[PDB]
Amino acid sequence: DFAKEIDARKKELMELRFQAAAGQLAQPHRVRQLRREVAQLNTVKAELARKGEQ
RNA sequence: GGUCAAGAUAGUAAGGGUCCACGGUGGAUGCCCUGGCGCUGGAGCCGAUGAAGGACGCGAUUACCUGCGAAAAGCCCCGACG
Ligand SMILES: [Mg+2]
Ligand SMILES: [Mg+2]
Ligand SMILES: [Mg+2]
Ligand SMILES: [Mg+2]
Ligand SMILES: [Mg+2]
Ligand SMILES: [Mg+2]
Ligand SMILES: [Mg+2]
Numbered sequence: 001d002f003a004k005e006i007d008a009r010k011k012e013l014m015e016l017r018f019q020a021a022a023g024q025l026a027q028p029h030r031v032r033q034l035r036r037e038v039a040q041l042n043t044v045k046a047e048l049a050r051k052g053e054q
Numbered sequence: 055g056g057u058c059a060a061g062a063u064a065g066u067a068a069g070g071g072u073c074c075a076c077g078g079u080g081g082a083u084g085c086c087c088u089g090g091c092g093c094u095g096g097a098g099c100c101g102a103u104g105a106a107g108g109a110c111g112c113g114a115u116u117a118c119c120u121g122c123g124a125a126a127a128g129c130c131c132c133g134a135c136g
Contacts, residue, residue, distance in 0.1 A: 006125090016114095020114065025114055027114090028114035028115095029114090031113090031114070032113085032114095032128095035125080035126080035128085035129095036125090036128085036129070038125055038129090039125040039126085039128075039129040039130090040125085040129060040130075041125075041129095042125040042129075043125070043129045043130050044129095044130080045125095046125095046129095046130085047130070047131090
């Protein structure tokens with residue numbers, strides 16, 4: 001299921017980039033906060049990959 | 055006092071010179087250290103699970119440096135500080 005939440009994050013992240021090329025970007029923090037949720041995502045996936053399979 | 059004669063003799067500065075005073079220039083000098091040099095003593099290999107050194111790129115705004123790498127001034131677990 002993890003990839004679904006990853007890509008849902010990626011869509012709004014690109015939406016923020018698109019506004020940021022424009023004059024609208026009132027909450028820049030949401031930018032970097034959206035990316036760490038991606039990284040944590042991927043990280044935890046690797047944390048399951050070794051688990052169980054050994 | 056006046057005229058004539060003969061004689062001697064100042065001052066003037068265009069610009070200059072020596073000295074004094076006030077600056078401009080310039081960055082010597084003292085002081086300092088954000089940087090070096092040397093000795094002693096430690097520690098001493100990286101790489102095909104990708105080295106050394108790089109090229110692009112990552113930031114709301116980022117030309118240079120750092121750090122980092124599309125999971126990108128970073129992600130997770132432990133411990134320390136508070
Ligand atoms: Mg005469
Ligand atoms: Mg002087
Ligand atoms: Mg010194
Ligand atoms: Mg290397
Ligand atoms: Mg950008
Ligand atoms: Mg990937
Ligand atoms: Mg502290």
